[PDB]
Write a protein that binds this ligand. Structure first.
Ligand SMILES: OC[C@H]1O[C@@H](O[C@@H]2[C@@H](O)[C@H](O[C@@H]3[C@@H](O)[C@H](O)O[C@H](CO)[C@H]3O)O[C@H](CO)[C@H]2O)[C@H](O)[C@@H](O)[C@@H]1O
Ligand SMILES: OC[C@H]1O[C@@H](O[C@@H]2[C@@H](O)[C@H](O)O[C@H](CO)[C@H]2O)[C@H](O)[C@@H](O)[C@@H]1O
Ligand SMILES: [Mg+2]
Ligand SMILES: [Mg+2]
Lengths: 729, 729
């Protein structure tokens, strides 16, 4: 009522010109030069800013608000995806921690730094489910699993927003991309999404819903068609589902140029009609293309739009500014005037300890033949590969205000660890790619890839001479961050050919070979799994990446990360995911659902990851054989560290509904516990399962649990499990 | 009414035991030994037989019917997919004729031979739309296009059934696989199908509907889930759509073991429940697993199914036998007792002339650098490759009663063409595969691949010496038919590595290189398109394949075939198809829908194919710029043969609806004309477009044409076109 009073009196004052100006979301660019933008803010024609990210710059913009009749403050947004200035691992690496508190910590520090620079909103978290490793943006999400992505979706929102959206160290979450953006056909960015409603409700929508139920202040709408209707023009998605069914009360934001793109989708013949479709579907705020400002007045005057369409959009912008505390104090995130100036990028405003501890948790040990890892800080260590000394790659895609020169490379991380106790020998070995067309693509906007002008053969000969002079080879190989970016979809999932040629030459020297992988998507690693002695998955591990990688390689931290996305044997197996249907003819002979020209199944399954120690699970026990409606059941198992080193693992609870009105998955994740144990230590793990855990969407979207058998599986990954059954009454 | 009266009086006489026995469809095998099967027919416990394919054998079975109380005759079925004894090109090759009359001719001759052997029914045509080249069964269909597959669906049914199903030279069509079988996830056979209802009705269902509207007597139900519900248990598909909405009056047949497989799908806990789900969904007839015989009496007595369920299934079997003339005369397709015996496989019962003329029409010329084709009947011709002398491969998969020793190989076809006027030099060059696991798979049941015991290197050095002694190299390469079979899904679309190694060695000799491809799916041909001088796509061209291939290679027939399925550049681009959506960011730079690591688009588009002559199109003319509802529009263009040889091409009419309430394809096929022209000859081509051509299914399945612009394209393929607009009023 108090908020409603302030907001209703303010909107009673406003002209349509002022209401429509609140819907304009812009950035300083060629589209909107700084001084023209300043004039537009003075004239009341701007609602919010993105990509202006420092206190002085945001202050100068907020200072123009004084010259408007109503003095409605701006909010300031940015893409703080996995860090603002202190860069954490990419989301796919954070997910691999299997630890909500580690992810929450990355989010809280991101919000602290962003809010310290004056930012009120992040276009995050990205909660799109990804089953297609070809898509460039899988790096930005939490992998293939609905339960895990849904849990981390809520965690990110609560950690960004705190208990109070007005707090100077809180930012608003704009959850993206609503919806289904990750299921693009062919894994080609922006491409067609087509799926049944039961799959959509069961597998793809719950993460957006968790963000809404966690109190997300905003929702960013996606660029893709859903079943033939672009999200930006999809009333069924933005009004019926998001508002009426889920009760979302916040702000909807279109993606960059999305209203105008309704023309190229063939939903609209002109910008006037595109604008009508977007506002009536339920898009409040319009990013960069300015069609709302250009066309809403004419649409309203012609009776094509209703006043209520303008009023609803405007109300959502004002309610967001109110909740962010910006009517109370527009400078609340910008300090007091006469606070002394600072270097935005000062070393003292970073959080290196938080970045290092988080980065350690996401590293996944994929292979370790004969205890080669951990390494001893001694002897001669060859560090070879195009990513060994790469500052720009270790902070990954969507590195926000991250500064490459402030990042710790793998080489530098190893140098910091050994000091004088061991000798590092360096050789680039190869360029990230040997294909000139792929280098032209990676270098097309900014210099992202250091191209060594020497021949491939000369770099190899140097690498082989370096390996020969060492006790063992740490090969730092994989993708540059520009390969797992928006619009950077891949037809091949292997390590690039220039680097595989290097690895083959390194193998033939007979030296022990440790692979340190940098990559923003699942890679095809058949040759590496056969021929490398050890493999460490490091994703893009952030500002402190190299230090956290050295901490695991030398045994300071025992690798605890587990995969949250299945690793295909090749691109021709796509899609592969752990929660698939059985079919009528599952492969364990010939007449089964399989390929004939390659081994079947993923190379590494969902939830896979090794340790320097060994863990054991006692038999799974259920607290009863039968479960009454309204009752809870307990699944009990004892986890023991039966090896020589302290270490964490992740105990995973899976569920199967083997008889149902729909064909249900062979298994679905329904719980986990990350557990840190000393040698010989045990922990009794108790999972609680109720009827809520057993429901699914039928063909008419009835969300019900049916009577009958459920199988419960517990294990340290999605493959290596045992099951016990109970009956729901 | 006469039919209704005959069938109602017969079913009034029948016990449930006799009604349920009519639902049993069996074959002689280990599951059902001959003499036990004979006794079951005598006892009235068998409805129909499959895989018994000679007159004496079918007669012996029909002779047992006398011993039953009611003497209800059997029908006899077989998989006559692309020929019975005289084998035509695989369906994907027949589709490439772009000529309904050529396809009708292959179907009519198939029915003539099958009916001459006593068969009443073929499990054909297969009308599944296929956009995923990995799937093993794309060989069995007509490619990726809804309009073309729908047209050929009706053509096949009318050609099999004639105007009279009782005629002794007619067979019943059982259209398959109802439904969506070709959209399996990952292109893995039997795998999950998930799609929106608008896409299902717009793109996938029309071919089954065309079969039903053409009077198909039966429908074979598919093995896949549709949106979580197996087809065999899918009441929405088999009752609501097929019976109530489409008014199908004929027979439904389950696939082999499909009812029992409902347990592995997780729709049923036991065989009793699987049986209930199948009969109540609307499966009439049960192939080989015998659950109907085992369980229907107990299901009925317990009130779990209704008498009406048994009565409806039984009635459909009796109505099928009645329409096939089997109550009037059960021997109508089996001759008289007086008839003299014959050799079923006599050379005089074949139709070589029809198979040769059909096979010529499907061959697609993909590349011809500098007029290398046609070849002259002179000089020295090297014939090299594992498929050059392959009889088993040229007749393709699903070769019914085809005899490989009666087939004409490419080598033999070339020998028959040159006689003494030129010298052929033969060298195998390589085995079909160099991977022992792939050879074990292809050779697992019968010897399908002749494995040359010599080393790869020894075969190469013999091939290179043969090339060096010749004027040019005809390399006969591709897949064995067992690679494009049921359950033979591929993760790689290139020619096998043993053969690519051979092709590379052949390229390095400098000799002119003609590639003759045998394959049952689109192949990835990037290297071949760059390095071969000529490329001829021959699919698997049947019993007279080698003669038809020689007829095109030596210029007797001017290549006229055009692709009906897009050829991907690599497996990592799947799916690619011509009738895709534009997206919001079509590729004409970086922020578009594309891959960065490979050239974009298909290597060869839908409707692509070259000629030994050159054709030109005059500018497209529309009969008016505006079109009243209920009125017809004319699209006119003049085709000229502006080159030196008689030859045919295919003029293709495409439509775009660029503003619609759903995002509509960049292009959809809406007509074509195959035109044969002498040099210097012209023909004015007139296409008729009406309102039915302009409709689409919206989000609520409203099937309407919306007022506004339509773009009309005419060209010789889906890429190289010119467009004009009209407005629907
Ligand atoms: O002509 C009939 C029909 O055949 C179908 O293909 C079948 C396969 O589905 C079948 O697979 C077997 C199982 O159904 C059976 O119960 O078990 C064994 C393993 O023990 C499987 O091999 O195999 C036969 C081969 O004889 C195939 O014909 C086609 O899908 C369909 O198109 C065709 O009309
Ligand atoms: O920061 C706002 C949103 O930006 C989107 O990326 C932009 C492209 O769509 C646009 O066309 O080009 C620029 C490159 O200069 C990109 O910033 C993302 O898709 C969104 O996630 C992001 O929130
Ligand atoms: Mg159940
Ligand atoms: Mg239109």
């Amino acid at each position: 009522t108090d908020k409603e009073r302030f907001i209703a009196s303010l909107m009673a004052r406003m002209s349509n010109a002022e209401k429509i100006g609140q819907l304009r979301l812009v950035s300083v660019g060629a589209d909107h030069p700084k001084e023209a933008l300043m004039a537009d803010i003075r004239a009341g024609k701007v609602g919010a800013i993105f990509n202006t990210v420092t206190r002085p710059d945001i202050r100068a913009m907020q200072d123009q608000v004084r010259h408007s009749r109503l003095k409605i403050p701006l909010f300031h947004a940015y893409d703080v995806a996995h860090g603002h200035r202190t860069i954490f691992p990419i989301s796919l690496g954070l997910a691999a921690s299997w630890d909500p508190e580690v992810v929450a910590r990355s989010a809280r520090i991101s919000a602290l730094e962003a809010s310290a620079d004056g930012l009120d909103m992040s276009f995050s978290p990205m909660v799109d489910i990804t089953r297609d490793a070809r898509w460039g943006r899988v790096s930005e999400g939490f992998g293939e699993d609905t339960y895990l992505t849904s849990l981390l979706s809520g965690v990110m929102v609560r950690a960004y927003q705190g208990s109070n959206l007005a707090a100077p160290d809180s930012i608003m979450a704009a959850v993206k991309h609503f919806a289904l953006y990750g299921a693009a056909e062919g894994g080609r960015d922006y491409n067609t999404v087509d799926m049944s409603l039961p799959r959509m409700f069961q597998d793809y929508l719950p993460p957006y819903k968790a963000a809404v139920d966690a109190g997300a202040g905003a929702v960013m709408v996606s660029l893709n068609t859903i079943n033939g209707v672009p999200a930006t023009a999809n009333r069924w998605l933005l009004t019926d589902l998001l508002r009426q069914q889920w009760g979302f009360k916040g702000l909807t934001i279109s993606n960059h140029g999305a209203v105008k793109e309704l023309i190229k989708h063939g939903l609209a013949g002109n910008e006037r009609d595109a604008t009508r479709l977007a506002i009536q579907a339920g898009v409040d705020m319009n990013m960069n293309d300015d069609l709302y400002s250009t066309w809403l007045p004419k649409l309203l005057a012609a009776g094509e739009i209703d006043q209520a369409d303008i009023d609803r959009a405007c109300r959502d912008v004002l309610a967001a500014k109110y909740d962010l505390g910006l009517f109370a104090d527009p400078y609340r995130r910008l300090g007091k005037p006469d606070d002394p100036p600072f270097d935005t990028n000062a070393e003292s405003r970073l959080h290196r300890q938080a970045a290092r501890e988080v980065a350690r948790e996401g590293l996944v040990l994929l292979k370790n033949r004969d205890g080669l890892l951990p390494l001893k800080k001694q002897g001669r260590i060859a560090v070879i590969g195009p990513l060994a000394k790469s500052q720009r790659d270790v902070i990954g895609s969507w590195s926000a205000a991250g500064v490459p020169r402030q990042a710790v490379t793998v080489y530098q991380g190893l140098a910091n660890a050994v000091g004088e106790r061991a000798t590092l020998l360096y050789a680039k070995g190869a360029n990230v790619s040997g294909d000139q067309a792929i280098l032209d693509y990676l270098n097309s906007y900014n210099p992202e890839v250091e191209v060594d002008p020497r021949s491939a053969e000369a770099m190899l000969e140097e690498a082989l001479r370096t390996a020969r002079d060492a006790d063992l080879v740490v090969a730092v190989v994989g993708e540059s961050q520009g390969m797992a970016h928006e619009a950077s979809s891949r037809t091949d999932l292997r390590i690039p050919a220039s680097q595989r040629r290097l690895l083959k030459a390194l193998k033939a020297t007979g030296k022990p070979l440790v692979l340190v992988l940098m990559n923003g998507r699942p890679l095809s690693l058949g040759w590496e799994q056969e021929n490398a002695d050890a493999i460490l998955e490091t994703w893009f591990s952030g500002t402190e990446g190299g230090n956290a990688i050295a901490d695991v390689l030398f045994g300071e931290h025992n690798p605890s990360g587990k995969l949250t996305m299945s690793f295909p044997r090749s691109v021709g197996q796509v899609p592969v995911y752990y929660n698939h249907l059985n079919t009528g003819r599952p492969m364990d002979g010939k007449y089964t659902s399989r390929y004939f020209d390659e081994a079947n199944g993923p190379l590494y399954p969902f939830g896979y990851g090794l340790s320097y120690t060994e863990f054991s699970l006692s038999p799974l026990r259920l607290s009863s054989e039968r479960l009454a409606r309204g009752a809870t059941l307990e699944a009990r198992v004892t986890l023991s560290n039966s090896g020589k080193r302290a270490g964490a693992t992740v105990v995973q609870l899976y569920l199967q509904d083997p008889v149902a009105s729909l064909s249900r998955p062979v298994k679905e994740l329904r719980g986990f516990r990350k557990v840190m144990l000393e040698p010989g230590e045990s922990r009794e793990i108790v999972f609680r399962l109720g009827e809520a855990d057993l429901k699914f969407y039928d063909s008419q979207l009835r969300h019900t649990a049916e009577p009958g058998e459920f199988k419960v599986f517990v294990g340290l990954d999605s493959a290596q499990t045992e099951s016990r059954s109970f009956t729901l009454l």
